[PDB]
Design an enzyme around this catalytic site. Structure first.
Site: not given
Ligand SMILES: O=P(O)(O)O[C@H]1O[C@H](CO)[C@@H](O)[C@H](O)[C@H]1O
Ligand SMILES: [Zn+2]
Length: 573
Positions: A36, A130-131, A301, A303, A305-306, A391, A402
């Site tokens: 990313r 993702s988000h 979110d 993509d 998965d959340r 998360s 997920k």
């Molecule tokens: O920034 P972190 O905490 O390392 O990672 C964060 O994004 C990841 C990808 O979605 C998730 O698996 C984690 O649960 C979330 O805490």
């Molecule tokens: Zn996502």
């Protein structure tokens, strides 16, 4: 019309396959969620995308690469279509036999994990950040999944980084144009090759929807969400990829009203909002839920998965609890009836609400580090059936990612089963198993090495003989075990260290400090707090009030304020 494209391909003749020289980059290391960067890294930097894609191809063995199938799809953010065109041309030039692409490039992450396994593909390429926000001035990412439908393990991603660091030529078929809009097969005649190349454009929703149809009982869902006495709901897709899935599944097939869904149209910038489901980034949804009109709200979110699960009047069941309710009535879903409870799992920062349902039902529970790797390791061993991350992560072993809409459909199935409101289900659960008051503070983008200094000095403070057993309170907690969470994988023997500092007290309450791996510039400090309470007189109280002592102790022990300069967290959940 299709005929014009066919005749065009016939007249232009066979498409050449060409090698072009390139120069390698240095920062093409795929993280926990792929690679990313900011959008301009991929849109403006020369051959950045080409270098990474061809590195991905080289990471696949030549045997598995000639003639095989590969899923390609994304969350419909900016630049996704152009990058997908480049992926198509390179794949054609790299011996791939067939690309199954979602219509217009649309394919949720669980949908990609599903199709990969269904069509027996060698893997997939997911265009998602993702988000993270999208658009010209947003972010952009590439996630590589392998033949089990899950993320590429560390071996593969490391191979891609190494190959990307030295790559100096790539192959592409530049005269290949492909319409991502029209469904069906699309063949291309390649120069010096005898077999034609195939690009199959499938419906973005159909396969995923069939899988959900075999996982849940859609009759109960239709009676619940469709009739005149329907359960009023509101689903906010955040202009993300789950929009088409919400509309085609919940609205069309399951019969919920069309005004039940909002923001169900994927926009290349996600409508300017942040495609992350939580109370801060989903203000419109919580404020619409605040009038006392819907009994169930949910957000996704970018993509897909959340997910965020909300009750009437804006009642908030935090993810750590959501997964514990799903576990507590896991046998309301026909899928787990079929499989049984293979196991439970949660990430270490996630609250121990799931642990209570695991202890009451005599089921193994694995406290894994942050990330998917361990969840997939357990799932492939038939030792895990339901898992969740704080998360806003909830998933089962039906696929190897997920799944937000799956968690929503599970919540609707359990709602229809128990015939209660979300708040009643949650409260009855709290009195049944005790409540795990949970909170998480995010301090976004703080200058690193100030955060790293806080982590090193904090850990040194944690390992001291005059530390375990010390009294703290703010009108009392005593330290029981402070450490740097280490995890030994019981499937492949992998050992993982750091993973977050842990402060565990004698009442079971935990303060966790974690440095982020999601971040770009600088570092993000994540503070998790999880306190248990069984005294049913204290089961209901404001969590930010119930936890305030542990928060004050967390920053007073970490010296967060004096070393970061920040006075308030960036986002509280
Ligand atoms: O920034 P972190 O905490 O390392 O990672 C964060 O994004 C990841 C990808 O979605 C998730 O698996 C984690 O649960 C979330 O805490
Ligand atoms: Zn996502």
């Amino acid at each position: 019309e299709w005929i014009s494209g066919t005749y065009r391909k016939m007249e232009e003749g066979p498409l050449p396959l060409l090698t072009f020289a390139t120069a390698p980059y240095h920062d093409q290391k795929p993280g926990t969620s792929g690679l990313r960067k900011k959008t301009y890294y991929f849109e403006e930097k020369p051959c950045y995308l080409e270098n990474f894609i061809q590195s991905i191809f080289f990471s696949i063995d030549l045997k598995d690469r000639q003639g095989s199938s590969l899923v390609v799809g994304g969350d419909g953010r900016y630049f996704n279509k152009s990058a997908i065109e480049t992926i198509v041309q390179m794949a054609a030039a790299n011996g791939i036999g067939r690309l199954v692409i979602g219509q217009n490039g649309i394919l949720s992450t669980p949908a990609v994990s599903c199709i990969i396994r269904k069509i027996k593909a060698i893997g997939g390429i997911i265009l998602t950040a993702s988000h993270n926000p999208g658009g010209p001035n947003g972010d952009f990412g590439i996630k590589f999944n392998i033949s089990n439908g899950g993320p590429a393990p560390e071996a593969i991603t490391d191979k891609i980084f190494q190959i990307s660091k030295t790559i100096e030529e790539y192959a592409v078929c530049p005269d290949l144009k492909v319409d991502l809009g029209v469904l069906g097969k699309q063949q291309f005649d390649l120069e010096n090759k005898f077999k034609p190349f195939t690009v199959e454009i499938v419906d973005s929703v159909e396969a995923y929807a069939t899988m959900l149809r075999s996982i849940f009982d859609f009759s109960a869902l239709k009676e619940l969400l469709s009739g005149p006495n329907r359960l009023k709901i509101r689903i906010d897709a955040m202009h993300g990829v789950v929009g088409p899935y919400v509309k085609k599944i919940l609205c069309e097939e399951l019969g919920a009203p069309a005004n039940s869904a909002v923001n169900c149209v994927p926009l290349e910038d996600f409508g300017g909002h942040h495609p992350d489901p939580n109370l801060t980034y989903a203000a419109d949804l919580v404020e619409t839920m605040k009038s006392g009109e819907h009994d169930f709200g949910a957000a996704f979110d970018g993509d897909g998965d959340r997910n965020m699960i909300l009750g009437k009047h804006g009642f908030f069941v935090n993810p750590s609890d959501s997964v514990a309710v799903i576990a507590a009535n896991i046998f309301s879903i026909p899928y787990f009836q079929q499989t049984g409870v293979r196991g439970f799992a949660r990430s270490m920062p996630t609250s121990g609400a799931l642990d209570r349902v695991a202890s009451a039902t005599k089921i193994a529970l694995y406290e894994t580090p942050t990330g998917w790797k361990f969840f997939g390791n357990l799932m492939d061993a038939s030792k895990l059936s339901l898992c969740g991350e704080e998360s806003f992560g909830t998933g089962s072993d039906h696929i190897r990612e997920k799944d937000g809409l799956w968690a929503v459909l599970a919540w609707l199935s359990i709602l229809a089963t128990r015939k209660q409101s979300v708040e009643d289900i949650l409260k009855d659960h709290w009195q049944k198993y005790g409540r795990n008051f949970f909170t998480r503070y995010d301090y976004e983008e703080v200058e690193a090495e100030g955060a790293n200094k806080m982590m090193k000095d904090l850990e040194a403070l944690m390992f001291d003989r005059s530390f375990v057993g010390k009294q703290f309170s703010a009108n009392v907690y005593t330290v029981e075990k402070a450490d740097n969470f280490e995890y030994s994988d019981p499937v492949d023997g992998s050992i993982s260290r750091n993973q977050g500092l842990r402060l565990i007290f004698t009442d079971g309450s935990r303060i966790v400090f974690r440095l982020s791996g999601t971040g770009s510039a600088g570092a993000t400090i994540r503070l998790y707090i999880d306190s248990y309470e069984k005294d049913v007189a204290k089961i209901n109280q404001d969590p930010q009030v119930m936890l305030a002592p542990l928060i004050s102790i967390a920053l007073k022990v970490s010296q967060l304020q004096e070393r970061t300069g920040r006075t308030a967290p960036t986002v509280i959940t």
